[PDB]
Amino acid sequence: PGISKSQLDDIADTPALYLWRKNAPVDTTKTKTLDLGTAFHCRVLELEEFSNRAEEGRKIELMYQSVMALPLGQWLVESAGHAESSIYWEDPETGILCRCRPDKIIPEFHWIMDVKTTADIQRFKTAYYDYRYHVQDAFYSDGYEAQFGVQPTFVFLVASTTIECGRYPVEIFMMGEEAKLAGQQEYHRNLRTLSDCLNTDEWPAIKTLSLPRWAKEYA
Amino acid sequence: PGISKSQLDDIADTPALYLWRKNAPVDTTKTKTLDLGTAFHCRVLELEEFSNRAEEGRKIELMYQSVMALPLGQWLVESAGHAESSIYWEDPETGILCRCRPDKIIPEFHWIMDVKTTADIQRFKTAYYDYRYHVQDAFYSDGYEAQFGVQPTFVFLVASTTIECGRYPVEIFMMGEEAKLAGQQEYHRNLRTLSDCLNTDEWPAIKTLSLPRWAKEYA
Amino acid sequence: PGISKSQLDDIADTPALYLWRKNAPVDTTKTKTLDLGTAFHCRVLELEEFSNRAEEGRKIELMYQSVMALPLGQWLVESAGHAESSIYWEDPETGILCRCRPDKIIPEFHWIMDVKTTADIQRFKTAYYDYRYHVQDAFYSDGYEAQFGVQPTFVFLVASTTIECGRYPVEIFMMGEEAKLAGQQEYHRNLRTLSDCLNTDEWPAIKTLSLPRWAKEYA
Amino acid sequence: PGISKSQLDDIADTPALYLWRKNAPVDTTKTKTLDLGTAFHCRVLELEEFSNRAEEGRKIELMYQSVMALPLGQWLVESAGHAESSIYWEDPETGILCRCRPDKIIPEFHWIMDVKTTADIQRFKTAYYDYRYHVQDAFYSDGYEAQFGVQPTFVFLVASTTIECGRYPVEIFMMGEEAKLAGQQEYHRNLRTLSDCLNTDEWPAIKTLSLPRWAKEYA
């Protein structure tokens, strides 16, 4: 297949951990049903397919009814567009094949939405960064434009699985220019580093450590 | 009805979340009795009505007996005044109708008290800010004066639902000039932003994000 | 009785909370046996009386055997001295009567020890400050000298009720000159404020609040 | 025996706690089986001896299979070398006898690996410092060179006992020049302080405290 964002996340850590992923055995024993977001993700998107695949099945129906509340979100879930459609493109600079498959893509006005669920909508507002959700904006937006004509509107639709004051809050987030850019420079920086490993068949694994700030080694 | 503080809190977040509130269905299933503060709130204020509406009913009686201890608080609960009385007024600048209903209002000396309960009286001293309790001072004080003659004394009566060293501590807090002001500028700023949405029927929902401080994107 | 350190801790917070203490009813229902330190405190000090007043009674014996390990501590528990002996004195400046009763006082070399127990010996090293244990040094040391001739050696004997790597660590701490002083200025500052309330029969209860650092009200 | 790193860690805290260790009775009652790392540590190293000494015995097999994934790690576990081999040497400066026994030592290319397990591979990246794992690099590397010819490559092999996204991540860490050095200066500084106690038979136990940063005693 191609290089997804989930991949550039591995090279980001350490080039080696990239091919590690594609080997380390998993413990096939999904015991928690915690992927309620995976469920929500399907409810919101594939509405029929949803009925397929506890006393929690009520939350999912309540949450979904919550995003239908705020207009901008209701518009997103509705409108006219495609869902899991994949997108492929060669990165101009590295010539590498990239792949990203936007949760929902509204053709008419070039809008890309991405469903995500959390426990703290407030925490999100700063957490996203460590999930590299800005690199996920830059990366889909770049692959999108570079295949459909122009940079789309990337909008994160976040929903909470932790009722607050009687309801389940929802929030539509968009990446700020300063960050959208940082993300674009990150994946390219990632792509280049991935390109070396290929041609020069070497994938460093050693993560070098450096004294922390509180290090008494300098007050 | 009018625009409460609880409303300007929504526009504060995002103009959209304001009309969201007035639509998102709640999960009518109050299972926790955790609103002991809601109870306390009634014990302290509506003394008779309280007997109406577990092995916890003892705490509520103990707490209430704790605020009767420190003089200033005992004075507050006693004295002569009205309780849930609503207050209405048009904001001079926006002409919008505002509403706020002070927990207890002592006419004689223009004192407004507001019962609140927490787990850390120490945490409160800095937490209040994220609950926008300063905007709740400015907003009641402004609506009060602007309807009774002069700015009252706003005093938060906080009580803990987490015994410490044998008792349940209570604390009367008042907003400091620097903060009381910040709160007054916030709600006005909120009101104005609310006034746009009305006349210009548009309510932005997209919350734009910005790189966090620790962002390696600049060391 | 007199004014203990535990009292100046109340006036420190708010003059009112001082006379609050002496009124707020307690919930006489000691259900936890958690005061294992209260126990330890007796084991280490009143060795016989200890046998008086679960599967935990083994820890207390193990801990006590741990402080007997490091020499300085074993010396402390042994040596020749008095225990709960109270000490009384008028504060030269305020003329107020002060009282403090050192856990163990070794006459021969003027050593005052104070048994204390915690969960993190590492946390202590910075936590003490919020317990005002430095004001407890200054206050006992001052009352001591001012009654026995000279400033003693104040040493905190801390023990953990949370085994680590197979044992229960113990640590003898002493207050650093910079802090010992800060503590001495605090209690005096406390004493003076206590002296006003007496002569001017007024005890403010209102704790004025001030915007926190992260207050967006200034970036 | 000699002075291990685990010892210089005690003198580091307080010279006394060093001889404390060698006296404080332990509570021989290993009830938790939590030393799964101790197990892992044996699985990875002593492969046969492992079969000797629950529904968790599957994780250990899964983890071990995870480090075999990333090449650099698989190389480490394989290759040709000795395991628990001890190493002894006199510290040139203090003349003291030092001892350190590297988990795995690959002779051919002078590589020293050290198996360690954690809950947060991300936390490690900054936590190590408080475990003094940099002093454990400097100390083994110094004893190694100073006995085999040259400074080896010290590599920490960390593994998580907390599945993430379906697998158990592994990470090979190496100490950065800045830190490797800080560690070397620490143990020497430790050794010297240990040398005093010996010749001058005195072992201070009192840990002097100093006001914390947030100390209102200076804003």
Short mmCIF file of C-alpha atoms in Angstrom, two decimals, chain D:
data_model
loop_
_atom_site.label_atom_id
_atom_site.label_comp_id
_atom_site.label_asym_id
_atom_site.label_seq_id
_atom_site.Cartn_x
_atom_site.Cartn_y
_atom_site.Cartn_z
CA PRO D 1 31.50 -6.99 47.86
CA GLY D 2 32.20 -3.78 45.95
CA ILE D 3 30.32 -0.50 45.53
CA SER D 4 27.55 -0.94 42.95
CA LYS D 5 25.64 1.87 41.20
CA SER D 6 22.74 1.05 43.51
CA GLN D 7 25.06 2.10 46.35
CA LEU D 8 26.31 5.44 44.96
CA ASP D 9 22.57 6.11 44.69
CA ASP D 10 22.32 5.92 48.44
CA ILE D 11 25.30 8.11 49.23
CA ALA D 12 23.87 10.48 46.58
CA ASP D 13 20.78 10.94 48.74
CA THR D 14 22.60 11.01 52.08
CA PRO D 15 25.87 9.28 53.14
CA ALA D 16 24.00 7.71 56.06
CA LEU D 17 21.21 6.06 54.07
CA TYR D 18 24.07 4.05 52.57
CA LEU D 19 24.81 2.01 55.67
CA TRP D 20 21.11 2.21 56.57
CA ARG D 21 20.31 -0.05 53.60
CA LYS D 22 22.68 -2.61 55.03
CA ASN D 23 20.54 -2.96 58.19
CA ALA D 24 16.92 -1.95 57.64
CA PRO D 25 14.94 -5.20 57.73
CA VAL D 26 12.78 -6.02 54.68
CA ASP D 27 9.21 -7.40 54.81
CA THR D 28 9.85 -10.78 53.13
CA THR D 29 6.38 -11.20 51.59
CA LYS D 30 6.62 -10.75 47.78
CA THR D 31 2.88 -10.56 47.04
CA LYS D 32 2.17 -9.12 43.58
CA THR D 33 4.26 -10.97 40.94
CA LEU D 34 4.63 -7.37 39.64
CA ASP D 35 8.33 -7.95 39.01
CA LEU D 36 7.20 -9.11 35.55
CA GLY D 37 10.14 -7.04 34.35
CA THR D 38 12.38 -9.18 36.56
CA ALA D 39 10.79 -12.02 34.63
CA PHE D 40 11.09 -10.32 31.26
CA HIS D 41 14.67 -9.48 32.23
CA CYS D 42 15.30 -13.20 32.55
CA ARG D 43 13.32 -14.19 29.46
CA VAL D 44 15.35 -11.90 27.24
CA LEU D 45 18.69 -12.82 28.83
CA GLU D 46 18.81 -16.27 30.43
CA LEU D 47 16.56 -18.03 27.88
CA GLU D 48 16.68 -21.53 29.41
CA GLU D 49 16.94 -20.60 33.10
CA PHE D 50 13.74 -18.66 32.31
CA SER D 51 11.52 -21.75 32.04
CA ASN D 52 12.35 -22.13 35.73
CA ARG D 53 11.84 -19.72 38.65
CA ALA D 54 -0.52 -16.92 35.45
CA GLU D 55 -2.55 -15.69 32.43
CA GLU D 56 0.23 -13.10 32.16
CA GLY D 57 2.89 -15.59 31.08
CA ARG D 58 1.54 -14.81 27.62
CA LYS D 59 2.44 -11.10 27.75
CA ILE D 60 6.07 -11.97 28.55
CA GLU D 61 6.11 -14.15 25.46
CA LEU D 62 4.43 -11.43 23.40
CA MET D 63 6.75 -8.66 24.66
CA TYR D 64 9.86 -10.71 23.97
CA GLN D 65 8.49 -11.28 20.49
CA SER D 66 8.09 -7.51 20.14
CA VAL D 67 11.76 -6.64 20.71
CA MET D 68 12.67 -9.34 18.18
CA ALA D 69 10.75 -7.22 15.69
CA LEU D 70 12.85 -4.04 15.42
CA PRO D 71 16.17 -5.18 13.90
CA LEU D 72 18.61 -3.40 16.27
CA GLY D 73 16.93 -5.08 19.21
CA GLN D 74 16.80 -8.51 17.61
CA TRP D 75 20.51 -8.12 16.97
CA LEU D 76 21.13 -7.31 20.63
CA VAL D 77 19.26 -10.33 22.04
CA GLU D 78 21.07 -12.52 19.51
CA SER D 79 24.70 -11.77 18.61
CA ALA D 80 27.49 -13.40 20.63
CA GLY D 81 28.19 -12.39 24.22
CA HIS D 82 28.10 -12.89 28.00
CA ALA D 83 25.27 -11.98 30.39
CA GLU D 84 25.41 -11.30 34.15
CA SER D 85 29.23 -11.22 34.10
CA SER D 86 30.43 -8.93 36.93
CA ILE D 87 33.16 -6.37 36.45
CA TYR D 88 35.48 -5.02 39.15
CA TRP D 89 37.90 -2.07 39.23
CA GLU D 90 39.52 0.48 41.52
CA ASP D 91 38.47 4.03 40.83
CA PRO D 92 41.80 5.66 39.85
CA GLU D 93 41.05 8.76 41.95
CA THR D 94 39.61 7.27 45.13
CA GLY D 95 41.25 3.87 44.92
CA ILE D 96 37.84 2.51 45.91
CA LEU D 97 36.68 -0.83 44.55
CA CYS D 98 33.78 -0.51 42.10
CA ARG D 99 31.46 -3.22 40.81
CA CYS D 100 28.85 -3.28 38.04
CA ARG D 101 27.36 -6.30 36.23
CA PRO D 102 26.00 -5.45 32.73
CA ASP D 103 22.85 -7.35 31.70
CA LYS D 104 24.39 -8.29 28.36
CA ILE D 105 27.81 -7.50 26.96
CA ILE D 106 28.56 -8.09 23.27
CA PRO D 107 32.43 -8.55 23.10
CA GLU D 108 32.88 -8.45 19.34
CA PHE D 109 31.83 -4.77 18.97
CA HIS D 110 32.00 -3.68 22.61
CA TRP D 111 28.27 -3.27 23.10
CA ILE D 112 26.61 -3.13 26.50
CA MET D 113 22.85 -3.50 26.63
CA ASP D 114 20.69 -3.10 29.71
CA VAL D 115 17.14 -4.49 29.77
CA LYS D 116 14.57 -2.31 31.51
CA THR D 117 10.76 -2.27 31.50
CA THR D 118 8.29 0.58 32.04
CA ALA D 119 4.65 1.69 31.64
CA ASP D 120 5.30 4.79 29.49
CA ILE D 121 8.02 4.64 26.87
CA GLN D 122 7.31 8.35 26.40
CA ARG D 123 7.62 9.01 30.11
CA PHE D 124 10.93 7.14 30.21
CA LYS D 125 12.52 9.64 27.78
CA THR D 126 12.64 12.10 30.71
CA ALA D 127 12.10 9.84 33.70
CA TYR D 128 15.33 7.90 33.44
CA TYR D 129 17.07 10.91 34.97
CA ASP D 130 15.41 10.42 38.36
CA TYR D 131 16.43 6.74 38.34
CA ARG D 132 19.93 7.98 37.63
CA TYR D 133 20.10 5.80 34.54
CA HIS D 134 22.71 8.21 33.11
CA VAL D 135 24.97 7.54 36.09
CA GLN D 136 24.36 3.86 35.29
CA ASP D 137 25.73 4.48 31.76
CA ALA D 138 28.79 6.39 32.91
CA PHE D 139 29.41 3.86 35.65
CA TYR D 140 29.25 0.74 33.55
CA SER D 141 30.94 2.29 30.57
CA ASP D 142 33.79 3.53 32.80
CA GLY D 143 34.25 0.25 34.59
CA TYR D 144 34.02 -1.54 31.25
CA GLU D 145 36.65 0.51 29.39
CA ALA D 146 38.74 0.55 32.51
CA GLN D 147 39.01 -3.23 32.23
CA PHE D 148 38.45 -4.12 28.57
CA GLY D 149 40.27 -1.36 26.73
CA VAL D 150 37.73 1.18 25.53
CA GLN D 151 34.40 2.89 26.30
CA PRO D 152 31.57 0.67 25.02
CA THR D 153 28.23 1.52 23.45
CA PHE D 154 25.67 1.64 26.29
CA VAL D 155 22.18 0.94 25.04
CA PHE D 156 19.01 0.74 27.14
CA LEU D 157 16.44 -1.69 25.79
CA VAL D 158 13.10 -0.57 27.17
CA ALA D 159 9.85 -2.53 26.91
CA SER D 160 6.32 -1.63 28.03
CA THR D 161 4.05 -3.66 30.28
CA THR D 162 1.00 -1.71 29.08
CA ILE D 163 -0.20 -2.56 25.58
CA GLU D 164 -0.87 0.40 23.32
CA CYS D 165 -2.89 0.31 20.10
CA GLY D 166 -2.73 -3.49 20.00
CA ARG D 167 0.94 -4.17 20.69
CA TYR D 168 3.63 -3.81 23.38
CA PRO D 169 6.11 -1.18 22.12
CA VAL D 170 9.85 -1.50 22.58
CA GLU D 171 12.52 1.20 22.37
CA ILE D 172 16.36 1.17 22.32
CA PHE D 173 17.68 4.29 24.09
CA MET D 174 21.20 5.63 24.33
CA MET D 175 22.53 8.37 26.54
CA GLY D 176 23.39 11.68 24.89
CA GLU D 177 26.93 13.05 25.24
CA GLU D 178 25.74 15.91 27.44
CA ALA D 179 24.07 13.45 29.85
CA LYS D 180 26.58 10.61 29.62
CA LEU D 181 29.08 13.16 30.95
CA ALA D 182 26.80 14.52 33.71
CA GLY D 183 26.50 10.92 34.86
CA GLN D 184 30.25 10.42 34.90
CA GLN D 185 30.73 13.52 37.05
CA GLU D 186 27.97 12.41 39.41
CA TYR D 187 29.34 8.99 40.32
CA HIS D 188 32.84 10.42 40.81
CA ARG D 189 31.40 13.15 42.94
CA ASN D 190 29.51 10.28 44.74
CA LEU D 191 32.67 8.14 45.02
CA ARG D 192 34.67 11.02 46.58
CA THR D 193 31.94 11.73 49.09
CA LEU D 194 31.92 7.97 49.87
CA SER D 195 35.71 8.07 50.34
CA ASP D 196 35.44 10.76 53.02
CA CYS D 197 32.98 8.77 55.10
CA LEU D 198 35.42 5.87 55.08
CA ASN D 199 38.60 7.65 56.17
CA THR D 200 36.77 10.13 58.40
CA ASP D 201 34.30 7.55 59.74
CA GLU D 202 31.43 10.09 59.59
CA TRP D 203 28.20 9.68 57.68
CA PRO D 204 25.88 12.75 57.82
CA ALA D 205 22.19 11.81 57.80
CA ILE D 206 20.50 15.14 58.10
CA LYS D 207 19.01 16.27 54.82
CA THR D 208 18.79 20.07 54.97
CA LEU D 209 15.70 21.59 53.37
CA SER D 210 15.28 24.74 51.34
CA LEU D 211 12.25 26.85 50.46
CA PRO D 212 10.54 25.74 47.24
CA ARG D 213 10.18 27.92 44.11
CA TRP D 214 6.49 28.78 44.61
CA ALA D 215 7.48 29.95 48.09
CA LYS D 216 5.50 33.16 48.52
CA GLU D 217 8.62 34.14 50.46
CA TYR D 218 9.65 35.81 47.17
CA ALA D 219 7.53 36.87 44.20
#
